[PDB]
């Protein structure tokens, strides 16, 4: 299971938004250095934007947010907390208007 802090973010263009995540891999929390972030399972977010809040909580910071381009019915971007190559099904909903 994964936990996002916060589960959802609603913001406007140009603002900054940060997501925290906890990755409990098969009953053991992996090191925050092992956690990587993905965007809509399509492209890895540059490691420059990552921030190690603590040994277990990873943080991603978005600067000068661009308006989220809708992909059909999906008007939000799915942010994924992943344990290296292996991602999880649960994602964070990022709304940029």
């Amino acid at each position: 299971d994964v936990v996002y802090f916060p589960p959802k973010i609603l913001t406007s263009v140009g603002s900054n938004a940060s997501f925290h995540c906890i990755y409990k891999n098969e009953n053991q929390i992996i090191s925050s250095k092992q956690i990587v972030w993905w965007r809509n399972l399509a492209e890895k977010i540059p490691e420059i934007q990552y921030s190690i809040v603590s040994d277990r909580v990873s943080k991603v910071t978005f600067s000068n947010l661009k308006a989220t381009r809708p992909r059909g019915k999906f008007t939000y971007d799915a942010v994924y907390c992943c344990n290296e190559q292996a991602c999880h099904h649960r994602y964070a909903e990022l709304y940029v208007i």
Binding site: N40, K73, Y91
Partner: protein, 138 residues
């Protein structure tokens, strides 16, 4: 019924479904090889070799796509139902017969379910199409 015509219509239908999935922009960018945990029930890279394996794979993809609330997936599910009927008609050729965590992943992660389902479906259909030139075993 001309079996050659059934095979040609099967290839045309497979190409049609592949093109429909290609038209969904947000699906071509997702790597069908990159594994996603929690969605192991969705036929990833099973070496599709028999007619019954193709039928069960397409039935699984059909059941998965049926739950999604989009009209594109509903249409793809109907096309997959037609493809399955065509596969049964092709099975009756060579005289041979053929025989619940989804709710949680649909409720919590609809986007992941749709994306992974469509990417695996595209890979499976490209494998079936590429293997249709060689006479497949029952």
């Amino acid at each position: 019924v001309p079996i050659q015509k059934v095979q040609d219509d099967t290839k045309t239908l497979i190409k049609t479904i592949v093109t429909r999935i290609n038209d969904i922009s947000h699906t071509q960018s997702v790597s069908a090889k990159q594994r996603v945990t929690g969605l192991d029930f969705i036929p990833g890279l099973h070496p599709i070799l028999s007619l019954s394996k193709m039928d069960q794979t397409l039935a699984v993809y059909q059941q998965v796509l049926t739950s999604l609330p989009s009209q594109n997936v509903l249409q793809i599910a109907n096309d997959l139902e037609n493809l399955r009927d065509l596969l049964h008609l092709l099975a009756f050729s060579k005289s041979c017969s053929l025989p619940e965590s989804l709710d949680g992943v649909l409720e919590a992660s609809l986007y992941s379910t749709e994306v992974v389902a469509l990417s695996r479906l595209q890979g499976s259909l490209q494998d079936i199409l590429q293997q249709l030139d060689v006479s497949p075993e029952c």
